[PDB]
Design a protein around this ligand. Sequence first.
Ligand code: QAD
Ligand code: QAD
Lengths: 176, 176
Amino acid sequence: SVAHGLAWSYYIGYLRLILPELQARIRTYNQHYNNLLRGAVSQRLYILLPLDCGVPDNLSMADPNIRFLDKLPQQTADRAGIKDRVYSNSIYELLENGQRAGTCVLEYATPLQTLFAMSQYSQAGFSREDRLEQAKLFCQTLEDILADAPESQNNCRLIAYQESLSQEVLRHLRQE
Amino acid sequence: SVAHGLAWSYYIGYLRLILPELQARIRTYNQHYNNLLRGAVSQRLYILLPLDCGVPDNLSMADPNIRFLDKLPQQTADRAGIKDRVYSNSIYELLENGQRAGTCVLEYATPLQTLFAMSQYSQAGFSREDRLEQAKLFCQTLEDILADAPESQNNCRLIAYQESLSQEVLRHLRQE
Ligand SMILES: COc1cc2cc(C(=O)CCC(=O)O)sc2cc1OC
Ligand SMILES: COc1cc2cc(C(=O)CCC(=O)O)sc2cc1OC
């Protein structure tokens, strides 16, 4: 199916390439700024999975209690003929009553934007019914993949939601 | 199908985002070095589509007559919560009898690597027969998409091949 391929490609072409070196990038960042407690960037990449497939480019649109703090220093690798293909990732502060309550690397799973766009292009032959069903299947397949993936054990957290996003991220950050 | 989703996501999530600003990046690069004639970087992104799905990270492995020259200055854009997500692309020289015969931005279509890996993972439930059939369908769907795409008219060239790659790229570079 469309979602099956998308979940496998997101893992193979992106998560499996960035997750093994993520915790070293986070450790280097936290150690540089001596971040401890709430200011310490979480050891996991937090992946937003909106079931409605609405993927905005600016997170401080979905919730004002989610504030951009810094870029995580880039990872580079030679990839498919791109010399030093750059992997950029952003650190956000999660606010509660105006103060920093948590810190984490956060981004949306871009294949969910593909499902939304496919439902809008006539040549994709993909309905709004297909979009919602394939969004659920994408999330489930990705969960199944990451459960067994050797690169992705203790450094990734999926956040699926339907329509407070900051409270939800903080719920996850607090558990650990 | 798996290939249908991959071709649409490669277009939606990558080509449609980089192709509108590609020719300005190439123009700025050529103008900086006053590149004219064979040394002028082609106005099109050349996308390698190996039908066997073998995607190496270093192009100077597939053919020695393909030599890395320079990185095209990066494009950045806010994307899915990644502030200034970086789009890196590499310029290659295509050699003929030891001399530079052509110059172009070149890379492999990474979703073809996903098909190869999916055929190797038991949980993907995807055979070697599925890989070859879906590789052909990916190439065909991508060709169909780019034919009508408003962002991708005169700035992209697909190079599908089965097993000289340099001669094939040069065949395309010479036509224009
Ligand atoms: C769905 O397949 C892919 C997703 C994905 C996301 C990638 C990212 O860099 C995440 C941010 C973005 O989509 O720009 S690379 C990649 C490659 C894929 O297949 C080869
Ligand atoms: C197959 O779907 C995608 C492919 C792709 C390739 C991307 C690239 O940056 C090309 C180089 C690479 O794969 O690292 S971004 C991207 C996003 C996709 O879906 C959201």
